[PDB]
């Protein structure tokens, strides 16, 4: 367990704004990274969510792994 989550399988509509409003439910977010495709201006299918608190990351990972966002099932892993 770490305070940084690798999030995969995100729908093309998800950006930093929408992922913050989803993942901020679990606790204080230090940083969110959703790289954009410089051609489509859409995400590349993954993000990093960093919590202040490892306990918040653990709660987020339990609750969001295999959860469905906009009709797509997401993958949540500890990063590092
Ligand atoms: Mg930290």
């Amino acid at each position: 367990a770490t305070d940084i989550l690798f999030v995969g399988g995100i729908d093309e509509t998800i950006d930093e704004k929408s992922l913050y409003d989803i993942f901020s439910s679990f606790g204080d977010i230090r940083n969110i990274e959703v790289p954009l495709n410089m051609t489509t201006k859409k995400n590349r299918g993954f993000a990093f969510v960093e919590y202040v608190e490892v306990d918040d990351a653990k709660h987020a990972l339990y609750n969001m792994n295999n959860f469905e966002l906009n009709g797509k099932r997401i993958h949540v892993n500890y990063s590092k």
Side-chain angles (χ1 to χ4, degrees), residues 1-11 13-80:
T2 68
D3 60 13
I4 297 174
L5 299 184
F6 174 61
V7 178
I10 53 166
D11 176 75
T13 65
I14 296 288
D15 51 34
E16 272 166 35
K17 180 213 70 149
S18 47
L19 212 52
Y20 180 92
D21 285 332
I22 290 156
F23 277 82
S24 65
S25 315
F26 304 104
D28 293 334
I29 289 181
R30 214 191 273 293
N31 193 43
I32 297 202
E33 266 216 57
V34 184
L36 299 197
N37 179 311
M38 307 313 184
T39 304
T40 66
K41 331 270 177 75
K42 305 293 193 174
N43 69 58
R44 307 185 204 140
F46 70 94
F48 299 95
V49 175
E50 178 180 346
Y51 288 91
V52 178
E53 300 176 25
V54 56
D55 286 354
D56 292 345
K58 294 197 219 148
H59 191 239
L61 180 145
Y62 163 69
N63 280 106
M64 301 301 300
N65 193 42
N66 295 311
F67 189 76
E68 204 169 276
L69 294 177
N70 303 342
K72 282 180 69 63
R73 170 155 64 96
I74 58 158
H75 319 300
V76 185
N77 283 295
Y78 295 114
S79 181
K80 292 121 189 134

